[PDB]
From Swiss-Prot:
It is found in: Cytoplasm; Cytoplasmic vesicle, Autophagosome; Nucleus; Cytoplasm, P-body. Autoubiquitinated; does not lead to its proteasomal degradation. Deubiquitinated by USP4; leading to its stabilization. Autoubiquitinated. The chain holds residues 291 to 468 of 470 of the full protein. E3 ubiquitin-protein ligase whose activity is dependent on E2 enzymes, UBE2D1, UBE2D2, UBE2E1 and UBE2E2. Forms a ubiquitin ligase complex in cooperation with the E2 UBE2D2 that is used not only for the ubiquitination of USP4 and IKBKB but also for its self-ubiquitination. Component of cullin-RING-based SCF (SKP1-CUL1-F-box protein) E3 ubiquitin-protein ligase complexes such as SCF(SKP2)-like complexes. A TRIM21-containing SCF(SKP2)-like complex is shown to mediate ubiquitination of CDKN1B ('Thr-187' phosphorylated-form), thereby promoting its degradation by the proteasome. The gene is Trim21. The coiled-coil is necessary for the cytoplasmic localization. The RING-type zinc finger is necessary for ubiquitination and for the IRF3-driven interferon beta promoter activity. Interacts with SKP2 and CUL1 in a RING finger-independent manner. The RING-type zinc finger is necessary for ubiquitination of NMI. It comes from Mus musculus. This is E3 ubiquitin-protein ligase TRIM21. Homotrimer. Component of a SCF(SKP2)-like complex containing CUL1, SKP1, TRIM21 and SKP2. Interacts with CALR, CUL1, FBXW11, HSPA5, IKBKB, IRF3, SKP1 and VCP. Interacts with SKP2; the interaction with SKP2 does not depend on an intact F-box domain. Interacts (via N-terminus and C-terminus) with DCP2 (via N-terminus and C-terminus). Interacts (via C-terminus) with IRF8 (via C-terminus). Interacts with ULK1, BECN1 and with ATG8 family members, including GABARAP, GABARAPL1, GABARAPL2 and MAP1LC3C/LC3C. Interacts with TRIM21 and SQSTM1/sequestosome 1. Interacts with IRF3. Belongs to the TRIM/RBCC family. Residues 8-185 form the B30.2/SPRY domain.
Amino acid sequence: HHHHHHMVHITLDRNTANSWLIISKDRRQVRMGDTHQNVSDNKERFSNYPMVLGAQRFSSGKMYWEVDVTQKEAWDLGVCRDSVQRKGQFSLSPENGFWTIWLWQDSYEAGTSPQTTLHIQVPPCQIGIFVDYEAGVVSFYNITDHGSLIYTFSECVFAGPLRPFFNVGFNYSGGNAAPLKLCPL
Ligand SMILES: CNC(=O)c1ccc(S(N)(=O)=O)cc1
C-alpha cells in the first residue's frame, strides 16, 4: 500500500476511557491498570470493556495511522461512529457503528456480524489502519509483513463522524498487560 502519505497524528481522549485505563502524558499509549484509576464517571466512558477513543473526528478525506500491539494476547482496533453506545453490553459490528479487527485466543477476526476469520501468516507487531470516508472503506495492513493486506470493509455506511477506536483487552491471564501505542510517522 501507498497510504503512508495520508498519515494523521492520533491522540487518545482520556474522557472516553474506561476508568481502569492509564493513558500516557503524551496521549499516545494506553494500558490496563490493576485497579480503578481514581477518575470521576461520565456519560462518555466505556463502562463494560477496556475501550477508549481517539480525540480526532473524521467526516471526509483519507486518513492513515499505525498501532503497536507487541506481546498482547487480546485487543480490538479500528474506527467507530462518534455516537456508539458507551454503557452496557454490545457487539462490535457495522450495525452498531464499529469497523474493527481483533486478536482473541490465538485467532484474528474481523468484526462483521457474524465475525470473519482472518488469514495472517506473520503475527503482526504493528497494524496500519486506513479510512477513505468518501469511498466508504476501512482497511487494515500488517506492518510486520511489508504492509500486507489483512482485511477491507467496503460499502461502509458510516452515518456520522468517525473516531479512532481501541480496546486494550482484559488481563485475566497476566499475559496481556502490554500497552497499545500509536507509532510515530
Ligand atoms: C468492572 N470491571 C471488572 O469487573 C474487571 C476489572 C478488571 C479486570 S482484570 N482484567 O482482571 O484486571 C477484570 C474485571
